[PDB]
Short mmCIF file of N, CA and C and ligand atoms in Angstrom, two decimals:
data_model
loop_
_atom_site.label_atom_id
_atom_site.label_comp_id
_atom_site.label_asym_id
_atom_site.label_seq_id
_atom_site.Cartn_x
_atom_site.Cartn_y
_atom_site.Cartn_z
N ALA A 1 92.63 81.86 90.69
CA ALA A 1 91.56 82.07 92.57
C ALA A 1 91.27 83.54 92.66
N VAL A 2 90.66 84.41 92.80
CA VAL A 2 90.40 85.50 92.83
C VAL A 2 91.50 86.44 94.09
N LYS A 3 92.13 87.67 93.63
CA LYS A 3 93.20 88.26 94.48
C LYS A 3 92.04 88.54 95.80
N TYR A 4 92.49 88.90 97.01
CA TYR A 4 91.91 89.64 98.16
C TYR A 4 92.68 90.68 98.62
N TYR A 5 91.96 92.16 98.50
CA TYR A 5 92.49 93.25 98.80
C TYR A 5 92.10 93.78 100.12
N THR A 6 93.05 94.11 101.09
CA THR A 6 92.42 94.41 102.54
C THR A 6 91.61 96.04 102.31
N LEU A 7 90.79 96.18 103.37
CA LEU A 7 90.80 97.66 103.43
C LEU A 7 91.36 98.42 103.35
N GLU A 8 92.57 98.16 104.11
CA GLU A 8 93.82 99.41 104.31
C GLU A 8 93.92 99.53 102.92
N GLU A 9 94.66 98.73 102.39
CA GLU A 9 95.64 98.58 101.13
C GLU A 9 94.16 99.40 100.04
N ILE A 10 92.98 98.99 100.38
CA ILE A 10 91.64 99.66 99.03
C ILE A 10 91.93 101.36 99.35
N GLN A 11 92.15 101.63 100.66
CA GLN A 11 91.94 102.98 101.25
C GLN A 11 92.70 103.91 100.30
N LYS A 12 93.68 103.41 100.01
CA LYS A 12 94.87 103.81 99.60
C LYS A 12 94.89 104.28 97.61
N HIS A 13 93.30 104.15 97.17
CA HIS A 13 92.91 104.06 96.04
C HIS A 13 92.47 104.87 96.10
N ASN A 14 92.18 106.21 96.46
CA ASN A 14 91.19 107.07 97.09
C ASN A 14 91.00 108.79 96.30
N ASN A 15 91.82 108.84 95.14
CA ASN A 15 91.93 109.88 94.24
C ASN A 15 91.83 109.70 92.81
N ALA A 16 91.53 111.18 92.14
CA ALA A 16 91.43 110.99 90.48
C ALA A 16 92.62 110.04 90.09
N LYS A 17 93.40 110.19 90.63
CA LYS A 17 94.76 109.23 90.02
C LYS A 17 94.98 107.61 89.93
N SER A 18 94.14 107.05 90.85
CA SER A 18 93.95 105.83 91.25
C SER A 18 92.36 105.28 92.44
N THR A 19 91.92 105.41 91.95
CA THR A 19 90.37 104.86 92.68
C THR A 19 89.81 103.50 92.63
N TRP A 20 89.80 103.05 93.59
CA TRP A 20 89.51 101.30 93.66
C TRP A 20 88.14 101.97 94.80
N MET A 21 86.68 101.15 94.61
CA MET A 21 85.83 100.75 95.32
C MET A 21 85.43 99.24 95.63
N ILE A 22 84.88 99.14 97.17
CA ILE A 22 84.30 97.84 97.22
C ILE A 22 82.62 97.74 96.80
N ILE A 23 82.04 97.09 96.47
CA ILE A 23 80.57 96.93 96.14
C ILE A 23 80.36 95.93 96.24
N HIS A 24 79.37 95.10 96.84
CA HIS A 24 79.13 93.70 97.45
C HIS A 24 79.96 93.53 97.65
N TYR A 25 81.04 93.30 98.77
CA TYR A 25 82.86 92.90 98.63
C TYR A 25 83.33 92.29 97.02
N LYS A 26 83.30 93.11 96.08
CA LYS A 26 84.18 92.19 95.15
C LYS A 26 84.57 93.95 94.72
N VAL A 27 85.78 93.96 94.51
CA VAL A 27 86.54 95.57 94.36
C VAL A 27 86.92 95.58 92.75
N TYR A 28 86.78 96.64 92.78
CA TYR A 28 86.99 97.42 91.84
C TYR A 28 88.22 98.59 91.20
N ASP A 29 88.33 98.81 90.01
CA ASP A 29 89.57 99.72 89.65
C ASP A 29 88.70 100.37 88.35
N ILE A 30 88.40 101.93 88.93
CA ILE A 30 87.08 101.90 88.18
C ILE A 30 88.23 103.24 88.01
N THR A 31 88.83 103.89 87.86
CA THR A 31 89.75 105.24 87.81
C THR A 31 89.67 105.45 86.09
N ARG A 32 89.70 104.22 85.56
CA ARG A 32 89.71 105.12 83.96
C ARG A 32 88.01 105.46 83.44
N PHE A 33 87.10 105.79 84.74
CA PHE A 33 85.64 105.47 84.19
C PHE A 33 85.30 107.04 85.27
N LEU A 34 86.55 107.07 85.60
CA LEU A 34 86.06 108.31 86.61
C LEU A 34 85.45 109.51 85.66
N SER A 35 85.95 109.80 84.54
CA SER A 35 85.36 111.01 83.59
C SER A 35 84.56 110.63 82.61
N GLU A 36 84.00 109.22 83.02
CA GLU A 36 83.01 109.18 81.64
C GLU A 36 81.51 108.31 82.52
N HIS A 37 81.73 108.76 84.27
CA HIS A 37 80.33 108.13 84.92
C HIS A 37 79.21 109.24 84.28
N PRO A 38 78.24 108.66 83.91
CA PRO A 38 77.02 109.49 83.71
C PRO A 38 76.83 109.89 85.22
N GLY A 39 76.75 109.83 86.45
CA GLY A 39 76.45 110.30 87.30
C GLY A 39 77.60 111.49 87.97
N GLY A 40 78.65 111.62 87.37
CA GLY A 40 79.79 113.16 87.17
C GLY A 40 81.00 111.89 87.84
N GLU A 41 82.08 113.11 88.20
CA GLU A 41 82.98 112.46 88.72
C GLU A 41 83.52 112.72 90.70
N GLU A 42 82.74 113.59 90.82
CA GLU A 42 82.63 114.27 92.19
C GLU A 42 82.06 112.82 93.37
N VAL A 43 80.74 112.26 92.73
CA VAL A 43 80.44 111.08 93.60
C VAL A 43 81.06 110.02 93.84
N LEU A 44 81.93 109.98 93.04
CA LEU A 44 82.92 108.72 92.97
C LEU A 44 84.29 109.01 94.08
N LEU A 45 84.79 110.18 94.02
CA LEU A 45 85.66 110.76 94.78
C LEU A 45 85.59 110.73 96.04
N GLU A 46 84.15 111.00 96.75
CA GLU A 46 83.60 111.02 97.55
C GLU A 46 83.71 110.11 98.27
N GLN A 47 83.15 108.55 97.78
CA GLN A 47 83.49 107.34 97.92
C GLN A 47 84.65 106.42 97.34
N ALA A 48 85.83 107.62 97.05
CA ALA A 48 86.92 106.38 96.77
C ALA A 48 87.66 105.80 97.44
N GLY A 49 87.94 104.69 97.47
CA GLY A 49 88.92 103.89 98.08
C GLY A 49 87.91 103.14 99.58
N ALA A 50 86.77 103.43 99.72
CA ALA A 50 85.97 102.85 100.00
C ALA A 50 84.56 101.96 99.74
N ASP A 51 83.91 101.59 100.85
CA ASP A 51 82.65 100.48 100.69
C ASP A 51 81.57 101.09 99.76
N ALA A 52 81.33 101.65 99.21
CA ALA A 52 80.09 102.19 98.11
C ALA A 52 78.98 101.51 97.68
N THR A 53 78.83 100.20 98.09
CA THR A 53 77.61 99.89 98.28
C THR A 53 75.86 99.76 98.09
N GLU A 54 75.75 100.61 99.83
CA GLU A 54 74.59 101.32 99.67
C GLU A 54 74.30 102.40 98.71
N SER A 55 75.49 103.34 98.45
CA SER A 55 75.25 104.24 97.59
C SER A 55 75.02 103.83 96.41
N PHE A 56 75.73 102.72 95.81
CA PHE A 56 74.98 102.11 94.16
C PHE A 56 73.97 101.73 94.22
N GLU A 57 73.78 101.18 95.50
CA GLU A 57 71.82 100.62 95.35
C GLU A 57 70.85 101.75 95.55
N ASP A 58 71.51 102.74 96.54
CA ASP A 58 70.74 103.40 96.75
C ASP A 58 70.18 103.85 95.37
N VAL A 59 71.19 104.92 94.80
CA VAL A 59 71.52 105.23 93.27
C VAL A 59 69.79 104.84 92.30
N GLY A 60 70.04 103.30 92.56
CA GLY A 60 69.49 102.42 91.43
C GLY A 60 70.00 102.42 89.75
N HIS A 61 70.90 101.87 90.04
CA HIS A 61 71.61 101.80 88.97
C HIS A 61 70.79 100.73 88.11
N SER A 62 71.05 100.68 86.63
CA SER A 62 70.51 99.96 85.77
C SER A 62 71.13 98.74 85.72
N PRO A 63 70.40 97.44 84.98
CA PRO A 63 71.16 96.70 84.69
C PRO A 63 72.26 96.58 83.69
N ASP A 64 71.91 97.23 82.50
CA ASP A 64 73.35 97.58 81.60
C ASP A 64 74.53 98.08 82.81
N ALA A 65 74.27 99.53 83.80
CA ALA A 65 75.20 99.72 84.78
C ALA A 65 75.86 98.57 85.02
N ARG A 66 74.84 97.55 85.91
CA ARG A 66 75.82 96.50 86.57
C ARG A 66 76.77 95.56 85.40
N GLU A 67 76.20 94.99 84.17
CA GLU A 67 77.08 94.51 83.50
C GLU A 67 78.53 95.68 83.28
N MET A 68 78.18 96.73 83.49
CA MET A 68 79.90 97.70 83.10
C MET A 68 80.35 97.57 84.01
N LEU A 69 79.98 97.39 85.59
CA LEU A 69 80.83 97.46 86.50
C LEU A 69 81.79 96.45 86.85
N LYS A 70 80.92 95.18 86.40
CA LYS A 70 81.95 94.00 86.07
C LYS A 70 83.06 93.92 85.38
N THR A 71 83.30 95.10 84.31
CA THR A 71 84.63 94.90 83.59
C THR A 71 85.79 95.93 84.42
N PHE A 72 85.49 96.14 85.59
CA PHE A 72 86.43 97.10 86.34
C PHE A 72 86.67 96.02 87.54
N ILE A 73 86.18 95.19 87.58
CA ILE A 73 86.81 94.38 88.51
C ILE A 73 88.18 93.53 88.83
N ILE A 74 88.91 93.75 90.00
CA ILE A 74 90.28 93.26 90.23
C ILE A 74 90.16 92.20 91.05
N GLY A 75 89.32 91.83 91.70
CA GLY A 75 89.03 91.29 92.97
C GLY A 75 88.35 90.97 93.74
N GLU A 76 88.07 90.72 95.49
CA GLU A 76 87.37 91.00 96.62
C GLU A 76 87.67 90.93 97.62
N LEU A 77 87.01 91.41 98.17
CA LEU A 77 87.98 92.11 99.69
C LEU A 77 87.93 90.78 100.52
N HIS A 78 89.18 91.43 101.31
CA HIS A 78 89.72 90.09 101.75
C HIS A 78 88.86 89.94 103.19
N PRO A 79 88.36 88.51 103.58
CA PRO A 79 87.88 88.04 104.24
C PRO A 79 88.13 88.56 105.94
N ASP A 80 88.87 88.87 106.42
CA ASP A 80 89.39 89.46 107.39
C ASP A 80 88.46 91.22 107.74
N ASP A 81 88.37 91.48 106.43
CA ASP A 81 87.60 92.80 106.88
C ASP A 81 86.06 92.20 106.25
N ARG A 82 85.79 91.44 106.08
CA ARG A 82 84.27 91.74 106.11
C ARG A 82 82.86 91.33 106.99
C1 HEM B 101 82.38 102.33 89.70
C2 HEM B 101 81.11 101.89 89.69
C3 HEM B 101 79.68 102.80 89.13
C4 HEM B 101 79.20 102.24 87.71
C5 HEM B 101 79.84 101.76 86.71
C6 HEM B 101 78.49 103.39 87.38
C7 HEM B 101 77.63 103.20 86.05
C8 HEM B 101 76.57 104.30 86.13
C9 HEM B 101 75.84 104.08 84.58
C10 HEM B 101 75.88 103.40 83.61
C11 HEM B 101 74.92 105.69 84.79
C12 HEM B 101 73.70 105.65 83.86
C13 HEM B 101 72.55 105.05 84.28
C14 HEM B 101 72.16 103.53 84.39
O1 HEM B 101 72.56 102.90 83.81
O2 HEM B 101 72.08 103.24 86.17
C15 HEM B 101 75.15 105.95 86.36
C16 HEM B 101 74.35 106.52 86.71
C17 HEM B 101 74.47 107.61 88.15
N1 HEM B 101 75.25 107.14 88.70
FE1 HEM B 101 76.59 105.77 88.98
N2 HEM B 101 77.86 103.82 88.56
C18 HEM B 101 79.11 103.46 89.62
C19 HEM B 101 79.00 104.17 90.76
C20 HEM B 101 78.23 105.32 91.42
C21 HEM B 101 78.57 105.24 93.02
C22 HEM B 101 79.25 104.65 94.09
C23 HEM B 101 77.74 106.46 93.04
C24 HEM B 101 77.34 107.43 94.28
C25 HEM B 101 78.53 108.13 95.11
C26 HEM B 101 76.78 106.70 91.82
C27 HEM B 101 75.91 107.78 91.03
C28 HEM B 101 74.88 107.95 90.07
C29 HEM B 101 74.13 108.43 89.78
C30 HEM B 101 73.58 110.05 90.77
C31 HEM B 101 73.39 108.31 88.63
C32 HEM B 101 72.79 109.20 87.83
C33 HEM B 101 71.61 109.57 88.46
C34 HEM B 101 70.68 108.16 87.93
O3 HEM B 101 70.58 107.55 86.41
O4 HEM B 101 69.99 108.18 88.77
N3 HEM B 101 77.15 105.47 90.93
N4 HEM B 101 76.14 105.18 86.96
#
């Protein structure tokens, strides 16, 4: 079963030492990619600990980027927060 994380817990992972993000209700820990993102680290920090779905789609990420995203998954957003 997937683990659920609350928005309350996810918001605590909002800096360079630990960055989590929600994208389409899936929760990712991208801390280790913060310095390797082709779009740079600052745009990730700007939305660290939050739902970045809209920004991820608006930028227009490639299929390869979406396959890479799967490698950072840790769970899904708790339903009380959906
Ligand atoms: C945490 C999951 C994310 C992953 C795995 C990811 C991955 C990537 C990859 C692989 C690229 C290279 C081009 C491509 O393949 O599309 C890229 C480019 C980029 N990303 Fe992300 N990204 C993520 C989140 C974001 C977020 C949240 C933002 C917005 C704040 C963002 C903004 C950008 C920008 C501006 C570029 C470069 C411009 C572009 O080529 O149009 N990315 N990202």
